[PDB]
Amino acid sequence: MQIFVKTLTGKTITLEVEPSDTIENVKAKIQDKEGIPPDQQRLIFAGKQLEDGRTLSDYNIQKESTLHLVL
Amino acid sequence: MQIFVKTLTGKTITLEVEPSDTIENVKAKIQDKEGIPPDQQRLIFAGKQLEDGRTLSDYNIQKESTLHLVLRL
Amino acid sequence: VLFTRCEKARKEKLAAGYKPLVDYLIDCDTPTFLERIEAIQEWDRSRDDLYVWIPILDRMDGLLLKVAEKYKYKQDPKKECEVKLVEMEAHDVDYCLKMLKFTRRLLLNTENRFVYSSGDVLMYLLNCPNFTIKLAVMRILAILGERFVIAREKIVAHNIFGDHNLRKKTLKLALSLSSSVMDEDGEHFSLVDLYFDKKKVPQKWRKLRFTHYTSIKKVTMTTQELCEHSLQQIFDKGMALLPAESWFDFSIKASVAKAFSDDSGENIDLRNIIIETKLNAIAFVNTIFSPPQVSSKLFELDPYAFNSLTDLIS
Amino acid sequence: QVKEKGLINNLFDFLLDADHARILTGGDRSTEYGTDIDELARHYPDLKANIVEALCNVIRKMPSTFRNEREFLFTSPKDQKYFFHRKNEEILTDKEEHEPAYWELLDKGTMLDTFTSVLFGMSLGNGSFSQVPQHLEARDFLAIIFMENPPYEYFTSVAISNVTEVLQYLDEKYEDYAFMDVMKVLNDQLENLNDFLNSPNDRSFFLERDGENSVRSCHSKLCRLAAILNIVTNVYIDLTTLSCKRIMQIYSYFDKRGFSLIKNLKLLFQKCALEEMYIRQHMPDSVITETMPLPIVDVSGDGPPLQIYIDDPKKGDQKGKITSVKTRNTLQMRTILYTLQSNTAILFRCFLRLSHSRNMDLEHKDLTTEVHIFENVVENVIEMLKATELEGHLPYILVLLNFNTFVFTIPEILQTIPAYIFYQKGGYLLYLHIIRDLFTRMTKIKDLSSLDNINYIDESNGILTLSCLINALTFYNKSMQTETMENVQSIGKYYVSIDDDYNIMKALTVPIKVMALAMILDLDKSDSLFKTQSRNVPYSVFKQLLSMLKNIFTNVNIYTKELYELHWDLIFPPIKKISLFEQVGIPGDVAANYLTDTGDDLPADNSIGLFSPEQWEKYKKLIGEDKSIYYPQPMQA
Amino acid sequence: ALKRIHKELNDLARDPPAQCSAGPVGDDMFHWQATIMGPNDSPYQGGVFFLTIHFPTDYPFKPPKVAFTTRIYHPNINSNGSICLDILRSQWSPALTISKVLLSICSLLCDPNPDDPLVPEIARIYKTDREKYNRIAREWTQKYAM
């Protein structure tokens, strides 16, 4: 399903993910769309930083969710 | 037909729906009457949640049937 | 207390409905006012807001002061002079009790009691050597402060709990007697046993032995001497051999000894009064001290308090 | 059953009863009740019409329940006079509460508190309340807010706060629902006070009329006006609330209703300051300090009117020691006057700011209206300053100077265009004359050591003179440094028939410097400022003069051969020529097009042929002997 | 207050401000964690700041308690996280929303209030030396906010 990712320091994009996908996979997709490696990407949602080891299901991230990127 | 929705954190509301109506229509009407976005809405009937793709007739929801509304994050 | 304009207007409008009652207890002379307040025992209505009773309380607070100053119990901050251990006349004792008991009853049957503002009158009267007045004041103080622990905050309008002098006096009162003692024979004796014939009063409680450090001032009084001397005589004796600061403490211990010196009706009544004052002091200190502070100050020093309390309520 | 039986009507009808309204407490509980009614409307859209109809019906019915409950001003038993008359009088010293509290004890008071809390809750709901503008004209909504004969404390009450929230919500949603109506209400209220505003300026209106019912009537009018002004300044006209639509609405109002409002506000502030001064001159000092109006709930004290204490204000606890009927009446009067003055000053500052808040682009009509408003406000301020002589009115003059400084500044940097109009009308020359007179008066002061220890402002002549002189010198200094002036564009924005385009701020900076330097030289010629053998001037005054010298000798990169008077009707395309053409018969659009094409030049002959024969005759007849009044003219020395 | 907090969170979710984000902590809707990004052209620009918000049982009739969990340099912000803001102290109204509070805090970040500060030292160094205040704020943000 589709997800919304706004770059606070850049532009906004949309991605496709699955509930089981880890935040590391999301960061890898962000790198593919932009280029910055996951280590430098900072992911924020609902006022809490997103951890690579976790996943969307653990964070309860739903469809059309809007996340924030700091780079 | 008329159904009831009980908000565990409030009062009960009434919805005018039909058996063929999908759960998405019910969620939209619940948002209209309450203002909660449909994605934040979780509906429970007889202890089981409801899938947006299915219809009321699929879940065997009939006239006067009372659903429960909960929110999950 | 400070009320917002809307709150003050609402309170005034509410009190406007109690005007006949206020005129009933305010348009009468002092003896009639006393005989009228003493006739108010049961509440046939919901708990009245204490604000509507402000005119009455002040009047009572006016009279109590006249008795506090008459015996000089009012401690003057301008003077380092202490308070003499002088008993109150029985007439004055009844006069003060008639109003203190009514204050207890009123505080029991009212809410929004933060408006209660007498405060210092109770502090002054606590210095009275007579133990009935001490019991009444301790009862009123214990009913208060219970709100201050239920809410733990909020304007209170007396704030007497902060003072360290009152804390020290209350701790001394709560430690009067011991919930359990080891008699000479070695058999445990708890204060509850005072109401059963299966045991005898320990000889330790029957004799007075007070020691204070300035160089060590000692007052010793045997059972026979305590029986011969009156309570005021004992206070006079101790006052002549001890520094001022210790007098209050002595006034407790002596009063305890004289209570247990003989098994007379007056002595038994004084025993009951002292025990009730001890329980009320425990209740009060439980509300103006942190749990660890209470354990370190009272329960560790008096371990058998809980067992006696449980045994006394059946 | 609910719809037929009208239970929704019963949900509101009980709010017209004082007992139920008081029970609802008019706070939190009433807001929750309003939100609950809004949620009831939301859950059953079928009931929205009934709920709105019931709300409108109760709003319409509420004014009928108002009545003259009681009186707020009481004559003194000893002399049957409301206010003191001599500084040596005596005080009855009653035991009553020092400050009266009437509003919450009135039936309509608590009723309005509760009803406005309910309305605030419904607005918080953001549901059915959005439909009250329909089938309820604002002329009826305002009928409950601005009731006749309110208490002196009405403008500072929970009802007014809730009404402010509700009106802010409505203004944000419906921009033009009520602004015109409230402005009309304010103007009509000011008109009703014509007797009080136009009274002689040499004596106190109230003290002259003391002992008559006219005092009570005027005080009730002033209380209503104070409530109106508080609402206007808090909701509609505020520097923070000045939106583009708001500025356009103000322009439209002043275009289609005239400028009588500005004159009425000038008169209001002038008379309020005069009343405060005169009243303070007939009360014992103890009452003066006992009736200071400054500690109002939510004023903060900043801004005019300036407060002249008698005891140091950093001590506190100065109020409530002594009370009496006259003392309470004086307290009410002073509170009302203070709030009126403060709100009038805020309104004048907002009027002088207007579009420059947003820097939005303006059409010719909007620019002309803005400059007209500036001209009216500045001329009214100058008239206010000129009205009263400086002898014996030092407190009033100090308040006036503080008001002028506050009005001509941005929350501070000078407002360049209003200040330019101020200079063109002779305001700075008046300030110079006042400064010289105050300097001569200061030279008469017996000693100056005390003047250097000014922990606060008193009624002493020396300290008042020092404060007035310092205020005037500070205002003069702020108009000479380009760092503290709004950087408005050059005069080319306004005129085309000019010799040279010059930056308005820098061009204005020159004449002020010339006047200040001439004044300093004249003072030197008197052997006062310099050449003295003793410290004949306090430190602050000499520091201000040194700053003036430093600014005067600072350089600005313009030459400013001469300055052109700024007139609203002469802004290109000038309204005078357009109006003349309209009188002739030509449409305004054609006149504007011709003026733009010909570069602001009158048609000497009909060779262009756009004037009809009779039109040409009328044009030649109506021009007048002088054609110089249709072009900007240089400003005289 | 639950009906109010629900709609506040819904409003934030529908059109969240890109400057800040917030949500419940441990599903306790009365406890919220919020994120703020330093305002542009400010010494704190580019940083991330965490805040803890507690909603009183009588919300919105009383202001929420907002504390800066992350260390920050500002005249009106104390190291313990306490905030000195008008809307949270005296200018609170039920009409205000948490999003408006976050926007006001973000504006205050680049618009301090030296005349009425919380920690005197920061206000004094700000008034005496603007450049030194900017430098120290930048260093603190780099140390902690980044």
Swiss-Prot record, chain A:
Consequence when changing residue 48 to R: No effect on HLTF-mediated polyubiquitination of PCNA. Impairs ubiquitination by CRL2(KLHDC3) E3 ligase complex
Location of this chain's protein in the cell: Cytoplasm; Nucleus; Mitochondrion outer membrane
Glycyl lysine isopeptide (Lys-Gly) (interchain with G-Cter in ubiquitin) crosslink residues: 6, 11, 27, 29, 33, 48, 63
Record's comment on post-translational modification: Phosphorylated at Ser-65 by PINK1 during mitophagy. Phosphorylated ubiquitin specifically binds and activates parkin (PRKN), triggering mitophagy. Phosphorylation does not affect E1-mediated E2 charging of ubiquitin but affects discharging of E2 enzymes to form polyubiquitin chains. It also affects deubiquitination by deubiquitinase enzymes such as USP30. Mono-ADP-ribosylated at the C-terminus by PARP9, a component of the PPAR9-DTX3L complex. ADP-ribosylation requires processing by E1 and E2 enzymes and prevents ubiquitin conjugation to substrates such as histones.
Effect seen on changing residue 54 to D: Decreases affinity for UBE2R2 in CRL2(FEM1C)-UBE2R2 complex
Purpose of the protein: Exists either covalently attached to another protein, or free (unanchored). When covalently bound, it is conjugated to target proteins via an isopeptide bond either as a monomer (monoubiquitin), a polymer linked via different Lys residues of the ubiquitin (polyubiquitin chains) or a linear polymer linked via the initiator Met of the ubiquitin (linear polyubiquitin chains).
Protein name from the UniProt record: Ubiquitin
Source organism (scientific name): Homo sapiens
Section of the entire sequence shown: 1 to 71 of 685
UniProtKB/Swiss-Prot annotation, chain D:
Function, as annotated: Probable ubiquitin ligase protein involved in many cellular processes, such as transcription regulation, maintenance of nuclear structure, cell cycle, mRNA export and rRNA maturation. E3 ubiquitin ligase proteins mediate ubiquitination and subsequent proteasomal degradation of target proteins. Involved in transcription regulation by interacting, and probably mediating, ubiquitination of some subunit of the SAGA complex. Required for SPT7 ubiquitination. Participates in mRNA export from the nucleus by regulating the transport of hnRNP proteins.
Underlying gene: TOM1
Subcellular localization, as worded in the UniProt entry: Nucleus, Nucleolus
Protein name: E3 ubiquitin-protein ligase TOM1
Quaternary context: Interacts with the ADA3/NGG1 subunit of the SAGA complex. Interacts with KRR1.
Family: Belongs to the UPL family. TOM1/PTR1 subfamily.
Additional comment: Present with 350 molecules/cell in log phase SD medium.
Curated annotation (Swiss-Prot), chain E:
GO biological process assignments: protein autoubiquitination; protein K48-linked ubiquitination; protein modification process; protein polyubiquitination; protein ubiquitination; ubiquitin-dependent protein catabolic process
GO molecular-function term, one example from the UniProt record: ubiquitin-protein transferase activity
Outcome recorded upon mutating residue 143 to E: Abolishes histone H3 ubiquitination
Protein name: Ubiquitin-conjugating enzyme E2 D2
Effect of residue 63 to A: Abolishes histone H3 ubiquitination and decreases interaction with PHF7
Effect of mutating residue 89 to A: Abolishes histone H3 ubiquitination and decreases interaction with PHF7
Active site: 84
Pfam families for the chain: UQ_con (PF00179)
PROSITE patterns, per the entry: UBC_1, UBC_2
SMART domains tied to this protein: UBCc
Gene3D superfamilies, sorted: Ubiquitin Conjugating Enzyme
Effect of residue 62 to A/E: Strongly reduced interaction with CNTO4
Pathway assignment: Protein modification; protein ubiquitination
Family that this chain belongs to: Belongs to the ubiquitin-conjugating enzyme family.
Assembly behavior: Interacts with SCF (SKP1-CUL1-F-box protein) E3 ubiquitin ligase complex. Interacts with CNOT4 (via RING domain). Interacts with E3 ubiquitin-protein ligases CBLC, PJA1 and PJA2. Interacts with PDZRN3. Interacts with PPP1R11. Interacts with E3 ubiquitin-protein ligase PHF7; the interaction inhibits cleavage of PHF7 and promotes association of the complex with the nucleosome core particle.
Function per UniProt: Accepts ubiquitin from the E1 complex and catalyzes its covalent attachment to other proteins. Catalyzes 'Lys-48'-linked polyubiquitination. Mediates the selective degradation of short-lived and abnormal proteins. Functions in the E6/E6-AP-induced ubiquitination of p53/TP53. Mediates ubiquitination of PEX5 and SQSTM1 and autoubiquitination of STUB1 and TRAF6.
Keywords noted in UniProt: ATP-binding, Nucleotide-binding, Transferase, Ubl conjugation pathway
Domain UBC core: 1-146
Organism per entry: Homo sapiens (Human)
